[PDB]
Design a protein around this ligand. Structure first.
Ligand SMILES: O=c1ccn([C@@H]2O[C@H](COP(=O)(O)OP(=O)(O)O)[C@@H](O)[C@H]2O)c(=O)[nH]1
Ligand SMILES: *[C@@H]1O[C@H](CO)[C@@H](O)[C@H](O)[C@H]1NC(C)=O
Ligand SMILES: *[C@H]1O[C@H](CO)[C@H](O)[C@H](O)[C@H]1NC(C)=O
Ligand SMILES: [Mn+2]
Lengths: 12, 529
């Protein structure tokens, strides 16, 4: 129901 | 055209001199702007901005487009670095793609570039409008930008996304190099020379700055530390998500000081520089990819496999406002897996059911042009990539014993690792989506129940909530410990041999309970997608 995590790049 | 010695500070003076800044102004020197106890209109503006841009535009709009970032806090070898005039520093075309960007954030980006980039390097700033609606991004932008002489707006008439926008930008650029940035960035002092110097020395290097965080609520800039706080490399997981990981020991040893490139298996891909000639030679971007998502992993694999170097230059620091349909991204990922990943594409397909489907239905488009590119450049294979570029990677089995989902008969929901489970956290029960991802589990020959997308994690029996832990079995000497061994019994129970108990899907968190095969909450289907 959530997608396979992404959409915005993550930071460190 | 090749002079002796090193460029002088005056030779590298910036394209525009930054006006003196107010040290007590909002967000001066990169400090936090706390926007708290606002009047009634003010709270509606902030809320509107948040919903349009997914950052505190209220804050951005009250911060100078000209803000400095205070003292230069980079390691001393970065601050003192000198650059040879032979080979010369190449010119660059800055390419910024935008879609409905806030004015404050787009023009702070462009001003930052002009105040920090040497005049002798900054050939042009190309702003590619990916069909913005906001009217202030049309004639007002066009007129505002004329004064800078080197800034050009290119209009993509219909929204086709970042990939098409970047290729349009590259097609009109006249710089020797291309430098891609997003429309919500701030350049640190000295950011450009290290990228362009590295391309000058090594024309097949594709080079990224160290990307600093600009806080989406306060616009605080995370400044570099003068020790170089242990760095990160880019990686991928077997869902083909971009991620960050610590440098290995061998790379810490090779890098004598911070001016040395960091070799990176993957790049974030928002911010980087490349020779314009090499960008063309190495096959630019796959034109059949739509909107965005995956192009940074595709380009990572292509650069490495086809004989280039993917590098982070820690002396180069650029800040970025980090924030936070699926069909377009999955299709892009299938196209990169089919071209580059050889037999390892099946590891990805087993974890992303939508990707397996796109492959079976052959909806990912023709890849013959990317296969021809790979052949013409005589690229190495994905085994070579994993052995030579990413020898630290966890690589799952090509042909695992069994994989699928674990559905509970009692609540009809699926066992689910939840968000950001890298181990040490309980699991949850979640609606069965059939997509893989956080509901993906494998069964191993050692009776482990693995969730292995990024780390090799094992369902680990305890008195409390069951947890995921890093699997103890990982090679010939080692063993799978009792807590990580499970039997799926004829009565559909998941039995832990060590604790003599069965997994129950009742409660907030799945837990071990006295075995009761009549209890539907203890009955599991290990289903295949
Ligand atoms: O339809 C779109 C969506 C995004 N972008 C641009 O692509 C870049 C990446 O998007 P975003 O910053 O949201 O991604 P992230 O940086 O969070 O990965 C930005 O310069 C966006 O303006 C675009 O050109 N077209
Ligand atoms: C991949 O290349 C390596 C050497 O780099 C070679 O050992 C291996 O057989 C190749 N794999 C395939 C599937 O051809
Ligand atoms: C998205 O996250 C939710 C929890 O917020 C679940 O973990 C769900 O399984 C996820 N979806 C996918 C496809 O992994
Ligand atoms: Mn961005």
């Amino acid at each position: 129901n959530t997608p396979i995590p992404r959409r915005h790049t993550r930071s460190a | 055209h090749c002079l002796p010695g090193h460029y002088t500070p005056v030779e590298l003076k910036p394209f525009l001199d930054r006006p003196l800044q107010d040290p007590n102004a909002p967000g001066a020197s990169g400090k936090a702007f706390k926007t708290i106890n606002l009047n009634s209109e003010e709270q509606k503006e902030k809320q509107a901005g948040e919903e349009k841009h997914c950052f505190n535009a209220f804050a951005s709009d009250r911060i100078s487009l000209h803000r400095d970032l205070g003292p230069d806090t980079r390691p001393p070898e970065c601050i003192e670095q000198k650059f040879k005039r032979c080979p010369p520093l190449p010119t660059t075309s800055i390419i910024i793609v935008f879609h409905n960007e806030a004015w404050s954030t787009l023009l702070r980006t462009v001003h930052s570039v002009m105040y920090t980039s040497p005049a002798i390097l900054l050939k042009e700033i190309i702003l590619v409008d990916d069909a913005s609606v906001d009217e202030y991004l049309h004639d007002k932008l066009d007129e505002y930008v004329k004064q800078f002489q080197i800034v050009k707006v290119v209009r993509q008439k219909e929204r086709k996304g970042l990939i098409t926008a970047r290729l349009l930008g590259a097609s009109v650029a006249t710089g020797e190099t291309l430098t891609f940035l997003d429309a919500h960035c701030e350049c640190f002092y000295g950011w450009l020379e290290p990228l362009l110097a590295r391309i000058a020395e090594n024309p097949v290097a594709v080079v990224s700055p160290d990307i600093a965080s600009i806080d989406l609520n306060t616009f605080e800039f995370s400044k570099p530390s003068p020790y170089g706080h242990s760095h990160n490399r880019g990686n991928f997981d077997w869902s083909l998500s971009f991620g960050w990981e610590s440098l290995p020991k061998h790379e810490n040893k090779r890098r004598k000081d911070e001016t040395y490139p960091i070799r990176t298996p993957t790049f974030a891909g928002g911010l980087f520089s490349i020779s314009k000639d090499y960008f063309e030679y190495i096959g630019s971007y796959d034109e059949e990819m739509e909107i965005w998502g995956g192009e940074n992993i595709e380009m990572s694999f292509r650069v490495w496999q086809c004989g280039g170097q993917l590098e982070i230059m820690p002396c180069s620091v650029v800040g970025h406002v980090f924030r936070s349909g699926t069909q377009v991204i999955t299709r892009n990922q299938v196209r990169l897996a089919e071209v580059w990943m050889d037999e390892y594409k099946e590891i990805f397909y087993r974890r992303n059911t939508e990707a397996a489907k796109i492959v079976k239905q052959k909806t990912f488009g023709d890849i013959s042009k990317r296969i021809d590119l790979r052949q013409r450049l005589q690229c190495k294979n994905f085994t070579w990539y994993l052995s030579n570029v990413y020898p630290e990677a966890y690589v799952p089995d090509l042909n695992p014993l069994f994989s699928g989902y674990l559905k509970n008969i009692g609540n009809r929901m699926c066992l689910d690792v939840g968000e950001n489970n890298h181990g040490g956290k309980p699991l949850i029960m979640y609606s069965c989506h059939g997509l893989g991802g956080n509901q993906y589990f494998e069964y191993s020959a050692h009776h482990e129940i693995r969730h292995n997308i990024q780390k090799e994690l094992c369902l680990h029996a305890s008195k409390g909530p069951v947890q995921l832990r890093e699997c103890t079995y990982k090679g010939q000497k080692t063993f799978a410990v009792g807590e990580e061994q499970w039997l799926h019994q004829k009565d559909q129970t998941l039995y832990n041999e060590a604790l003599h108990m069965c997994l129950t899907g009742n409660g907030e968190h799945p837990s071990l309970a006295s075995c009761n095969p009549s209890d539907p909450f203890q009955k599991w289907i290990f289903g295949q997608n």
